[PDB]
Amino acid sequence: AVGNATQPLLVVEDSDEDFSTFQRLLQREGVVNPIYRCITGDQALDFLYQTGSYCNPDIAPRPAVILLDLNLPGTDGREVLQEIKQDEVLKKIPVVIMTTSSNPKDIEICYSYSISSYIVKPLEIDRLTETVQTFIKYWLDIVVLPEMG
Amino acid sequence: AVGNATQPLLVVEDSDEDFSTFQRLLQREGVVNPIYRCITGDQALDFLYQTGSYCNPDIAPRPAVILLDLNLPGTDGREVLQEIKQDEVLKKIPVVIMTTSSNPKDIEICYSYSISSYIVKPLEIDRLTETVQTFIKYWLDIVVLPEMG
Helix, strand or coil, X not given: CECCCCCCEEXXXXXXXXXXXXXXXXXXXXXXXCEEEECCHHHHHHHHHCCCXXXXXXXXXXXXXXXXXXXXXXXXXXXXXXXXXXXXXXXXXXXXXXXXXXXXXXXXXXXHCCCCEEEECCCCHHHHHHHXXXXXXXXXXXXXXXXXX | CECCCCCCEEEECCCHHHHHHHHHHHHHCCECCCXXXXXXXXXXXXXXXXXXXXXXXXXXXXXXXXEEXXXXXXXXXXXXXXXXXXXXXXXXXXXXXXXXXXXXXXXXXHHHCCCCEEEECCCCHHHHHHHHHHHHHHHHHHCCCCCCC
16 A cells, blocks of 8 residues: 555546546555546635535545646636635645646746646656556655645 | 756755655656755745745746755754645645654655655665655656646
8 A cells, every 4th residue: 555544636537537547556556545636627626625515525635735737627727726826725735737738838837836846748648657556656755745735 | 868957956955865856766767857956944945935045936946846854953843834825826846755763753744744745865876776766757757747837
């Protein structure tokens, strides 16, 4: 097994296939971190702020790490990121951007807000596997995360 | 070979043993990224601002990623971090903290001061090797770094 059962990973991904492929890869590595999924940006913000208008806050723990796609239905990931980095508490949570966008503008803006890192989703299974396996080792095993952020 | 020869890694580390062993691990893995080392906070700032002795941008290109130790001679890492994060251009460079300090205060505050991730220095060569190998894969191969050129 790998990871910490007390450090949730919030994955904001609207593609069911992308999420499923990702989830299965984490399961093959024995990751124990609980995975929470949001499909829209509106859900992501509600979940993080524990607003309770779209998600019950009682079953929405603060994540230790956030995997965020810039492209999302409703409020998009770009707007989610900007809002997050303006909050004294949420801005501390490591945010890893994982999207199909390789646009120089998105990369530049994201890093300007000090995202932790930017990852372009690779199409190839071998490359995606290496990407996810490394993400797991780095974030869930090596790095010291803030107390939930 | 691994990495990109046009994406420099700036390592702010005053420990000769820690730096030299780190560089040797990168060379053993075939990393082609140029490695620039600064030994004090003031020196790192001069390099990043391209002032003082690092007056020629062609000689001191902007690094694509920074590995910083919080403990440094004179202006310490904490002060260096806060300063570059206030600069329009430099704030885009991801900063990875790799230090001996494992105290909650530095960790919480560092994440508050916009770092990408925090890594506590391993004591045994076996774990250090594995840790650095993951650092290499993640930062120099997987992640899309900001365009600092």
